């Protein structure tokens, strides 16, 4: 499924991401935009053997299990397959656990290069929420 910007911001807000552990709502929209282009089915296989899954590109080495990944830790206790769905539930539930580590949103590399230190609330302006 490919979200529109305002569609994803209204969904991420119903999913409790507005101001979750100090991160305002535009951070989450800007992150989805550069990590997956708003696509719930995006997948990317990495240099290291891991694969990144879904709309928030959750990694198979630390967070979900894809059975092909070496030191797999499965912190979200979830098969990677469950994050490639149109329903954003599972991807939000795991992302809330990811951000609750001391590294915060720095675990999303596109967010670190394209959103941090930018006016992230622009990602939610012009929308009915």
């Amino acid at each position, epitope marked *: 499924k490919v979200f529109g910007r305002c569609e994803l911001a209204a969904a991420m807000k119903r999913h*409790g*991401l507005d101001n979750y552990r100090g991160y305002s709502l535009g951070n989450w929209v800007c992150a989805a935009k550069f990590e997956s282009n708003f696509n719930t089915q995006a997948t990317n296989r990495n240099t290291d053997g891991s694969t990144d899954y879904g709309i928030l590109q959750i990694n198979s080495r630390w967070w979900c299990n894809d059975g092909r990944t070496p030191g797999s830790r499965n912190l979200c206790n979830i098969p990677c397959s469950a994050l490639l769905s149109s329903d954003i539930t599972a991807s939000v539930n795991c992302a809330k656990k990811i951000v609750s580590d001391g590294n915060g949103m720095n675990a999303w590399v596109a967010w670190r290069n394209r959103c941090k230190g930018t006016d992230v609330q622009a990602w939610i302006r012009g929308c009915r929420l």
Partner: antibody
Amino acid sequence: DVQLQESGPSLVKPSQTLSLTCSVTGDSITSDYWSWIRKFPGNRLEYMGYVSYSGSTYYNPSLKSRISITRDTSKNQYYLDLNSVTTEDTATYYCANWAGDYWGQGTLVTVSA
Amino acid sequence: DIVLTQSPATLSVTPGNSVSLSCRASQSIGNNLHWYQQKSHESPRLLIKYASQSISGIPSRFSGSGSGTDFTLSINSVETEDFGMYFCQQSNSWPYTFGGGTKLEIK
């Protein structure tokens, strides 16, 4: 299946350091975030803190910095240290995973002369 | 620092009735609110996550709703094994906090 178990003394003196241990069985401690919760005598619950996978820690400010949470990956345990206890630290201490899915049985610690 | 207020503090009911418990947040926490049960001399038990997400192994008679600042836990036909303490907890902001508790007493 995961099981959690608290251990440590049940009676401590004012001003010493309370130390408790949480042994985890059924899965490695490297697969979750782990926390300490305590229940005061009138049903009052207090989330003390948690350690996350990177080793970073989150401590409740009500503790005033007397707490430390560390873990031992080879023993599969994690630990609570609480410095300079007073009679106000009298409570039932629980270990639990970060989301509240698994909890130990709880251990009543009494602080007294 | 989020304060969660639970009402009523005590609720007496007869087996087979339906009850509703409230948990109110002093600030908006979106859907970041979990409910636990605690029976006498037992550890807390997680019943509901994120305001309405159900959890395997829990009776279906429990469900939760609400968002922002106002949340509810309902129990359809309360059974005897339901009597004890009920607490809500927010995980939106550090420190995580708990509500004062509602007791469900057999009437």
